[PDB]
Amino acid sequence: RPVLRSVNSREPSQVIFCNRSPRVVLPVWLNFDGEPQPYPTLPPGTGRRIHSYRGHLWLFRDAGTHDGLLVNQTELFVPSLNVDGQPIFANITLPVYTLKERCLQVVRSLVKPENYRRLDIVRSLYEDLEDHPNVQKDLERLT
Amino acid sequence: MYVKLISSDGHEFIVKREHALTSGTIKAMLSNETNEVNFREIPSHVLSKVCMYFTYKVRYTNSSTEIPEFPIAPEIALELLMAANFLDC
Amino acid sequence: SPNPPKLTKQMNAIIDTVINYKDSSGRQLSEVFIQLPSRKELPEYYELIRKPVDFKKIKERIRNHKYRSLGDLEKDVMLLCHNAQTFNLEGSQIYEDSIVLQSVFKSARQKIA
Amino acid sequence: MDVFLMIRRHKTTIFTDAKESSTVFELKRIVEGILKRPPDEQRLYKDDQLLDDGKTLGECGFTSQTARPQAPATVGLAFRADDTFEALCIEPFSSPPELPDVMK
């Protein structure tokens, strides 16, 4: 069974998801079996109060490309119980991508996938362009 | 403490040593005159952009502030990707 | 109108096995299925699902002798699981939990002597 | 607030940072430490306009919003060879190739 999963606390926790990135954000909930599930997206520069539970696990991605994002400067967010009527903030931001990953993002945004192998670049980069970011491989790396 | 990174077309880029050490390849090249590295296949319009990346990485790594996007114009994207692949940064 | 007591006892034993099932993490998979989502919190559920049903309704239908056979009880449990698998996507927690519960129901019904 | 710059002369480009509150003369002191030429042997420019030593980088037009780490602002530099300053000359960087068909 996967180690990265939400705890079934059944204890409500109100969280403000703050999109402090220029990307449309996809919140991803890791369920009780450690499987990722998509939730409604957040436009850039918007904050929204949402209803979750203590010990639940969340990660955040670019909704269109699945590029990884940070939450409170780390990969995973776990709501805690609210104290003195205060919401918990999940501040979502861009990571400092490596230059290579940022270049791959830009090339993927400009060239259709069937045309990657027509680019005048070293062949090893075709596999890198095709190896699109995905939650499954990131969970494996984090585990 | 500065290093000089020289493009294929002879432009000399003077950057902080700690910023250049972002690249594992440059770290290996430094360990060419002392504190200087020549790049036979990286032209100046690309190497200048790599130096901007080093400044950006050092400024925003471990920062608690809102990080801006690192911009890449379409016309330099392929050459910058080749440089980043070679430089491992 | 009332069913033979043996039939009611059999219906309740099967449903109790489903409701009481706990997976290897100790989780009661049936819990979310006991009660339908409210119309105010999820009207989308009622717009898509033609015949909503939950375990509270199934238990009521056993108690009030609405089901006249184990086949009638199975039809509603299969409807509950079909609804869960219609509204919710494959791989979602609720869809996957309903697959397990369908299997628990089938095994429990088969073990009736 | 910090400003990120490229100080350029001929085929030399220095990447450095400073504050909007920094003065032009303070930038000449940065150049002196790197290129070993004193401030009185230097002229600094914004485009082709000579910057006054006593002005802040903010007073010259260098704002944090327009001099970012990822897109630094250019300051031109000219040196004094004996008694006269050379004309400002900044060699352009190389040109990118034409945008490929698969991007159009």
Author numbering:
A (entry chain C): 60 to 202
B (entry chain B): 17 to 47, 55 to 112
C (entry chain D): 1377 to 1489
D (entry chain A): 1 to 104
Task: Reproduce the article's own wording on this structure.
We aimed to achieve orally bioavailable molecules that selectively degrade the BAF Chromatin Remodelling complex ATPase SMARCA2 over its closely related paralogue SMARCA4, to allow in vivo evaluation of the synthetic lethality concept of SMARCA2 dependency in SMARCA4-deficient cancers. Heterobifunctional molecules co-recruit a target protein and an E3 ligase, resulting in ubiquitylation and proteosome-dependent degradation of the target. The synthetic lethality between SMARCA2 and SMARCA4, resulting in sensitivity of SMARCA4-deficient cells to loss of SMARCA2, has been discovered and validated by genetic methods, but pharmacological validation and exploitation of this synthetic lethal relationship has been hampered by the lack of suitably selective small molecules, in particular for effective in vivo use in animal models. We found that design of linker composition and exit vector placement could be guided and rationalised by ternary co-crystal structures, yielding molecules which exhibit high potency and suitable pharmacokinetic properties to translate to oral in vivo efficacy.
